[PDB]
């Protein structure tokens, strides 16, 4: 149980996020400030600041939310589930609805800012989805788990599932409407990985 | 006229290299930096916005040696088998060992470390493209917006960094892991 008053907090955070990438999206960065973003929140530009301390700190935390509501569905899925079945699923589930994605994957290209912002959900993403997979394979077992999650193996197919979303969206954003079906063909490649060797 | 400016450029970089190693990023600053590398401050912030970002030119050299290996293997060779010529050639030290695991423990160098690591796709698309084409540089522009050649270059990119890093963590070349990784795309449909 986390209270009211700070599910309200939270709440209010998240409505200023989606308020600046809805910005972002009509009319760009670059033209878009701080007080717009608090303005379309509906909120006093002292209230924006108290969670952001600029407009790229406001959409920034979307990025980390839907990389990692990914990770989580990734261990989530059922436990009879393939690694690639369970990131595949994974990926329906959790990442899809457009556009609104299309500028926020070409503003983490063109803003300095953004770009770290995306680097830094990249690799965090690549390391939960290490220990996600750790978690899939690991049968309940701590110590498993630790040795799993310290293998070039499963640091490498955390790679290339990141890797199989990420070209997608990227290359999407810089034709065809899904990146969706080109990420779930990306990770196709994991069939028949060796977790071993 | 150029070279010197690349010449001032790789001189700071090899003394951040120096000073990151013999005593830590936190030691060192911007413009010791400068010190070592006999420029003023101001020099080295017309090339690298932080003291990270000094040491970008050195992995970049060991990431294009293995793109232009790519572009240079025998032009019969497979794209698979181009990718592996290069990777022998490459990986087959603690300079580029202690620099790679430096960027454990620091966000800002991991993050110009992963920086590097991702223009170094963009070589390979075009390598690769290259190769494919057979010859039509208009073959080549289109092979390379093809998605399916973007991912096989992150592909092949992440087979030769998590090697990299694992070796770099390590007491033995990555040359071992990173053939193992790539085995990934043994079959892929590069169109």
Redesign the interface.
């Known amino acids: 149980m986390v209270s009211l008053t700070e599910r309200r907090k939270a709440e209010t955070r998240m409505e200023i996020a989606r308020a600046a990438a809805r910005l972002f999206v009509g009319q760009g960065l670059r033209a878009t400030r701080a007080e717009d973003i608090a303005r379309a929140a509906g909120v006093a530009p002292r209230t924006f600041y108290r969670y952001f301390a600029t407009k790229e700190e406001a959409v920034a935390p979307l990025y980390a939310l839907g990389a990692e509501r990914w990770v989580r569905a990734v261990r989530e899925a059922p436990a009879e589930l393939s690694p690639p079945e369970a990131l595949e699923r994974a990926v329906r589930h959790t990442l899809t609805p457009w556009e609104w994605a299309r500028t926020l994957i070409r503003l983490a290209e063109s803003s300095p800012a953004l770009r770290?912002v995306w680097?830094?959900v990249?690799?965090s993403t690549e390391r939960g989805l290490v220990q996600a997979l750790a978690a899939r394979m690991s049968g309940g077992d701590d110590n498993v788990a630790v040795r799993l999650a310290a293998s070039?193996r499963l640091?490498?197919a955390a790679?290339?599932a990141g890797?199989?979303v990420?070209?997608?969206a990227?290359?999407?954003a810089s034709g065809a409407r899904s990146p969706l079906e080109?990420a779930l063909l990306?990770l196709e490649?994991?069939r028949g990985?060796a977790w071993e060797?």
Do not use: D, G, T
Request: net charge neutral; hydrophobic share 50%; aromatic share 12%.
């Open positions: 770290k680097a830094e990249c690799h070039p640091h490498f790679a290339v890797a199989s990420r070209v997608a990227e290359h999407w080109q990306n490649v994991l990985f060797a």
